[model samples]
Each structure stands twice: as C-alpha cells, then as structure tokens.
Target: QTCLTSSQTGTNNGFYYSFWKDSPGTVNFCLQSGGRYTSNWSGINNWVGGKGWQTGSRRNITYSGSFNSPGNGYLALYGWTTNPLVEYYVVDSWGSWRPPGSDGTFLGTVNSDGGTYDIYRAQRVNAPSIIGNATFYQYWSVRQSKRVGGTITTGNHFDAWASVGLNLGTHNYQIMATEGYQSSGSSDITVSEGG
Candidate 1:
C-alpha cells in the first residue's frame, strides 16, 4: 500500500489535482481552497483491487468560513466502473450534506455517532474521458455544512464497492477530493491517503 499526504496555506484559491498508480489500481486526488471565504479540504483515493476502491477525507472550516459571497465547498470521491454498475457507501459526517444538483437520487438516510446523513446515488453523465470509456456512476454520503463548530471529519472502512452481477472490470481511476467554493480568505488543510 502507498500513502500520500498534502498540506497547503496562504491566500490562493483554486482546484488542485494529483495522481498515483500502484498494483491495486490508479488514484486521483483533488483539493479546492480559497475564493473569498476559507475552508480547509483534503481526501484520499485508495484502489485496492480491479473492482474495489476505498476513500476517506477531512474538511476543516475556521470560524471565519463563509459561503455567502463565494458559495459552495465539499469533499468527495469519484471513480469509473463497468456498465450496469451498482455501488454502496457507508458514510459519516459531523455536518450537513446535500447533493450539488437535483440529479442525485435519494436512496435513504441513516444515523451514526450522534449525527444523521442522507444517502444518495447518481450516474455520471459528465465524467471525463480520461478515466475510461465504460459507463460510470457515483455514490455520495455528503455533509454540506458551513461549519462543524470547528472541523468536521469523516471516514469509511471497506464499505464501498461497484458490482454488476459479477464484479465490474478494472476501474480506470479512483478519486477522493475536497473543493472550496469561490474562496478568498485563509484556509488551512491537511490530508493523508492510503489503502
């Protein structure tokens, strides 16, 4: 297994992309920060098998975190799978989570560690061709909150997968990421990833 860690500071804001490949599979990690307000973000993409992947992340928002002037920020995982793909996600969040758009299908909701979250599933219609040519889908357990008091942390075990009767073929890439919506203030973040 390979582990990666990243940290950044300052007043710059934008999207960051990173890539890694090993015997298990390929991984693409992303982070977003700085617009006007500030929120720290980090994530990991662990490809454990041809059809299996695991993701984990953490998002930290300072007392000064804001979304009014520059809105939107989130931590998420992405991947590509075979046709008729079916996936599962068991997640936990210390904040509120919601789908970016109305395209997400609400599967259900559950409670964990004194908090609650809604489960969602969606097919990827706008996936990049670099990941693969096969039909792809995504599952998210999101927490869209301005602040978790201070910082909101989340993690998952071997709880997510892609299936289609039999295991799907090799996934082109597994991506775990954190994005900052139009930020412009000072946001600090740290992330560690491994499988």
Candidate 2:
C-alpha cells in the first residue's frame, strides 16, 4: 500500500498517522495498526487523526468506524494544503459542526458521501496552522445531517469546493480525524487508503 514512510510526526500502517492535542485539557489516546486509533478527549481541544497522508491525495478514499460521544465533536475527513494555504474539513459529527460561525461566508450545499453538506468559506486571521501560526482560509463542508460512522467518498467534496470557486494549493497532510473541541468524546476510527 506504500503507506507513509518513517517520519517524526507520522507513522506507516497503510497510512501516515498522527494525532494532536491542545493545552489545559484531558486527552487519552493510542494508535493501532491498519489505520486505526482510539481517543478519548475532553477539555480545550484535541484530535486523533488516523491514516494521515504525508501529502493529500486526489484519489478516492474510504473509511468507516465508531465515533461515540455523549457531548459533542466530529469525525473529519481532513487535510491541509500550502500556498494559498487552506485547511479543509469534510465533517460528520454530533452537534453543530457548522464551523466558521459569524466569521464565514456560506457558499452552498453539496450532496456526497450519502449526505448533503453545507459548504462555507471562512478565514482565521492568525491561528495555528500547518505553516505555523499564520492567517489562512478554512474551507468547510459540514453535513446538514450527522452520522457517527460511515463510508465517505472524498473526491465529491473536493469537486464541490472547486465548483464554488474555492481552489487548493499543493497538498500537505490529510487524515480521517476524530476531534473533540470543548467537548468530551471517544472514537475508534479506521481509514482505508493507499498510495
């Protein structure tokens, strides 16, 4: 599968895998083989990203798993891109994962992954990003409906973005991440992807 090669932030097991957590909180996590990981987090912010891609891919990606949470959070098909730097999320979550609040411009909706998503364009003036703490645009695809586990076809979302005049740059890391932001949640998610 030509998974991810050796790296400090990413490990190979059918994917480049990594996870992240922010300060002042509770996050307990572990990584397993075959693009699998389990995370239980609550507090500031944390994300368990399994099967990360060293460089994002345009090829089809499919994943399935359990995202169990009593409060709120999301299971994301996520990634970063440089130059015209963009952080994108294709989220399936519990609660309002509409992201970008009043700081965003709602573009429209797209139907994919067996769900319809409300796409938005937003920007962070200066927030933590792949290129450090810099200002960047955030392209969001938040499903109008929510589901904890399912198979998502990543390409449709990308097409939906471009169709709305939102473009992308060179690929960076990509993952199927389970995140708990200001909420408590646990997940055992696995991604099925390859080179």
The positional error of residue 77 in candidate 1, measured at the CA in angstroms, is: 5.4
Where in model 1 is the C-alpha error above 4 Å?
1-69, 77-98, 144-176, 180-187, 193-195
Q: How close is candidate 2 to the true structure, as a TM-score?
A: 0.87
**TM-score result, candidate 1:** 0.42
lDDT of 2 by residue, 1-195 (tens): 332211226576656766666665766666677777677776645454556678887766666678877666778888888988998988877544545468778999999867998899998887988888899988988878777767667778888999999898899988887766678777887777542
lDDT of each: 0.33, 0.74
Models, CA RMSD each:
11.6, 4.1
Best by TM-score: 2
Error of 1 at 131 (Å): 2.3
